[PDB]
Amino acid sequence: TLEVWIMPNSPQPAEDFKALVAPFEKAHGVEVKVTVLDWGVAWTKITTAATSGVGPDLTQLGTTWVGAISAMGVLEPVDDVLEALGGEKAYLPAVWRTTRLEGARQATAVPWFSELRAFYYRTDALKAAGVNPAEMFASWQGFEAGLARLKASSFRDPETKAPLAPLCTPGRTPRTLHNAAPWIWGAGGEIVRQAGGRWQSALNSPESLEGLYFFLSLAQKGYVPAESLEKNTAQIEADFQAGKCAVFASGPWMIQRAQVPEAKGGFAERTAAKNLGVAPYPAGPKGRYTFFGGSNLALFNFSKNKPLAKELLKYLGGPEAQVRYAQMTGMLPALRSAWSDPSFQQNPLLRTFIQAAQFGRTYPSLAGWGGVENLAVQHLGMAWDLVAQGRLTREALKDLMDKASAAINQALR
Ligand SMILES: OC[C@H]1O[C@@H](O[C@@H]2[C@@H](O)[C@H](O[C@@H]3[C@@H](O)[C@H](O)O[C@H](CO)[C@H]3O)O[C@H](CO)[C@H]2O)[C@H](O)[C@@H](O)[C@@H]1O
Ligand SMILES: [Cl-]
After folding, report:
1. Alpha helix (H) ranges present in 29-129?
2. How many A from CA of 39 to the centre of ligand 1?
3. 248-281: b (≥16 Cβ within 10 Å) or e
4. Domain boundaries, the chain
5. Ligand 2 centroid from CA 173, angstroms
6. Whose CA is nearest to atom 23 of ligand 1?
7. Residue 50's CB: how many other CB atoms inside 10 A?
8. What distance in Å separates the CA atoms of residue 288 and residue 61, rounded to the nearest whole number?
9. Under 8 Å between Cβ of 58 and 299
10. Ligand 1 center from residue 114 Cα (angstroms)
11. What residues are in contact with ligand 1 under a 6 Å CB criterion?
């Protein structure tokens, strides 16, 4: 029996995973046993397995975790699998770079599925506000003027019978910079930069502060209600679904969720699901970026089932499994060839995610990435708390990212 650990990638994820692997099981005369870890906990259990030598054969990883787990020395080389799937050629570079610890000789993860972030919008709220989405999502200035028109609008969701918040974004200490990265990048900033053979914080670069301040100050100007500042990602998701928000940033999953009854983990019933639009991040002063992520699969080098686990990695990474699991999850395949399936191309909301991928940007794949993102989100949490007071100024934000930067630079030395 092979053991795979996965995250909750679909409404019934163990059952979707098991339907996905049934033909591998039949062709190999083997049973796969799946365990589903919540995203909130999956980090700790995966790190405990890596530290103790007790764990599955395969584990899903966040693309941004592959570096740290690889540096713990517990991942089996999978260059052989990536070759059987078509090698570097078979992947966007953004995806290809997630297959290894930055600068390591050997690949240690197999790309499974991709996700990137774009804005969902209420077509009804924007039509009623008189906002042309092409203009609002073209530029930072067009975005700010579309929120202003959304704030002034008479519109009220027909279910809630109240106004929509123009923008909903969470102010709770985030787990990651996924929401914030597009604004840092669009200003010409970065989280860390490589120069003179070392990585250092760029979160206190004037470009980073411009981007971050522009994002956080929207909330300060009235385009994000005080209630949103008190919420985490999952709560903002729920708020868009329940008709409280006209615009918010998420992954492609919400498209397949909008086509699924409430009773099945969806909101097809709700207005928002009937009035659903997608648009890319607006271009910033120094170009157009969005966070590009997903999950890879890794094999623990203490696995007793390496040969079969490798066949399972080639099965899951290959074209048929890639198409099939992207359809159940609402994600994108990791494999470029699999994007051509009509199931992705003739879905007009998903087609927008596909166009957005041109401007997908990734984290460098560093052993210490986790430590970096954790001090950054701590300081960014304190910034959100100043926005909850009306008291985020450029000075206070610079003071917080200087402290983040000094604590990030220690971590990297
Ligand atoms: O930072 C770790 C890791 O984060 C990954 O982002 C995930 C999101 O992909 C995930 O989205 C969930 C869907 O996957 C699932 O199907 O639906 C639920 C609700 O129905 C969604 O929340 O949410 C988690 C928790 O916030 C995020 O961590 C990145 O893609 C990966 O690149 C990164 O390494
Ligand atoms: Cl944020």
Report:
1. 39-52, 66-71, 79-84, 93-96, 123-129
2. 7
3. bbbbbbbbbbbebeeeeebbeebbbbebbbbbbb
4. 1-116+291-365, 117-290+366-413
5. 8
6. 39
7. 22
8. 27
9. yes
10. 10
11. 8-10, 39, 62-65, 115, 176, 233, 251, 253, 293-294, 329
